[PDB]
Amino acid sequence: GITLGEVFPNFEADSTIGKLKFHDWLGNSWGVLFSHPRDFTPVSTTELGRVIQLEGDFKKRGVKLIALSCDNVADHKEWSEDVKCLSGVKGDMPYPIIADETRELAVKLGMVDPDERTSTGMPLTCRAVFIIGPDKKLKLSILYPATTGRNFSEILRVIDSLQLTAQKKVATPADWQPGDRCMVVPGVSAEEAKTLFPNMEVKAVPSGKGYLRYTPQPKS
Amino acid sequence: GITLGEVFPNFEADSTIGKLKFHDWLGNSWGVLFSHPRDFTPVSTTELGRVIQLEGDFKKRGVKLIALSCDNVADHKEWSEDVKCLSGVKGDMPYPIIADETRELAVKLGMVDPDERTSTGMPLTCRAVFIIGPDKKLKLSILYPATTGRNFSEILRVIDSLQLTAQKKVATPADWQPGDRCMVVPGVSAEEAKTLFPNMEVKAVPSGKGYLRYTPQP
């Protein structure tokens, strides 16, 4: 498995764009790698279709997208046409699909589905998402089972928080949406906030501590 | 780390309700274990205050909530008064908070935060969520950093999916909300579908395979 802040593997893999080396492919960029159990399956088709719908939203954020399953590349290409059909968007695939036929990555990234296997007993991946920063380090992840399609707007929501909190000295509260007030991190001193967050609110709390601090979301 | 389908560690831990043994405390119930980096911090107070708002949503779904950080129980009890205040809900804490002071669970669960450490250099948990079925097996997990407060509506949404797809041979599509049409799982034959999903719809796709099968939510 991979824990937060680990450098993500500079793996080599075949895909729908040919063989790639992960750190080469990603470059100096945010990236999202996500997996699905099996090509030509229904939930997986709605998900890769949804990602097509949202591809300008990822592009606006400088976020490279890459899909993965344990199927071969020829199946990725043929299935891709079904994915396009269901997205309702016409055009080439806006992202590659890795073929993890050896289960190398499935195992290394701790993303084997607990329930879905080939008829032959081969593991398959679950619906994993890994958010990787331009530093190549793992920033956030989710492991959802095959039974449960993902919420891709939550992925974009958290890409928004992660890009903001990367540059500014805030953290985003429960249920935060882009443009909403943020929390000032406990590290910022009163004296430095005077200048940095001149309209900060300190909400009194029964403990008498001064940590419950809100500020408008900084421009970034 | 822990992976999907592993039986969740039957740990013994101190908490706001005293020392507990995890499988015993859970019993035959669904469970959500969730962690935050540090008590007396802003986002964490928002998040725990939000879970109090939603305690009844979880209760009606048979889901036991339990929170965790590396702080001590005394800090838990005192910080819990602020959490209650931010929640706006009056009354005793609706869930226990485990105290992982030795970092044993933070390490076992693969949930150490990549940036937050104590002043003294001790690791701290990130904002992790583990959903545990009645069989004690891990069914879903999320690892969010300290910077990035959670979405507890999504936790609810995915619990509704896990609970549905445990009982019926469907799976929930991208962005599904309760009440939305589900997909029939590929392992269901047309023969079985005639009986099990009388209103099933097969949507034509360029490959001509008939796997794209929608049904009303069972």
Show which of residues 38-57 on chain B sit within 8 Å of chain A, judged by CB atoms. 38, 40-43, 45-47, 49-50
**Highest CATH level, class, for A151-220:** alpha beta
Q: Min CA distance, B163 vs chain A (Å)?
A: 10
DSSP letter (8 states) at residue A118: -
- Give the H or E element holding residue A98: strand A97-99
DSSP letter (8 states) at residue B27: T
- Give the H or E element holding residue A123: strand A123-125
SS3 label, residue A177: coil
Query: Do residues A213 and A201 make contact, with C-beta atoms less than 8 angstroms apart?
Result: yes
Tell me the Cα Rg of chain B.
20
Separation of alpha carbons A31 and A201, rounded Å = 34
DSSP string, B68-130: EESS-HHHHHHHHHHHHHHHT--SS-SS-EEE-TT-HHHHHTT-EEEEEE-TTS-EEE-EEEE
CATH of domain B151-218: 3.30.1020.10
What residues pair up with A31 in beta bridges, in sequence order? A64, A132
DSSP letter (8 states) at residue B117: E
Of A139, A149, A174, the CB nearest to B172: A149
Chain B partners within 8 Å of A153 (Cβ): 175
Of A85, A139, A140, the CB nearest to B206: A85
SS3 label, residue A161: helix
Per-domain residue ranges for chain B? 1-150, 151-218
Query: Do residues A96 and A83 make contact, with C-beta atoms less than 8 angstroms apart?
Result: no
Q: How far is CA A29 from the centre of its chain?
A: 13
Chain A partners within 8 Å of B147 (Cβ): 161-162, 165-166, 171-172
CATH of domain A1-150: 3.40.30.10
Separation of alpha carbons A20 and A97, rounded Å = 11
Q: Which residue of B has its CA nearest to A138?
A: B114
Spatial CA neighbour of A69 closest among A128, A3, A22, A9:
A128
Handedness of CA B111, B113, B118, B121 (dihedral sign): positive
Show which of residues 88-107 on chain A sit within 8 Å of chain B, judged by CB atoms. none
Separation of alpha carbons A168 and A48, rounded Å = 32
Burial A29-53 (b: 16+ CB within 10 A, else e): ebbbbbbbbbbbbbbbbbbbbbbbe
- Give the H or E element holding residue A143: strand A138-144
DSSP letter (8 states) at residue B171: E
Resolution in A: 2.0
CA distances in angstroms from A74 to A4, A77, A101, listed in the order given: 33, 5, 12
Token digits of residue A4:
């937060």
- A19 CB burial (10 A radius; 0-12, 13-18, 19+): exposed
Q: Which residue of B has its CA nearest to A43?
A: B173
Separation of alpha carbons A25 and A35, rounded Å = 17
Separation of alpha carbons B97 and B72, rounded Å = 10
What residues pair up with A35 in beta bridges, in sequence order? A68
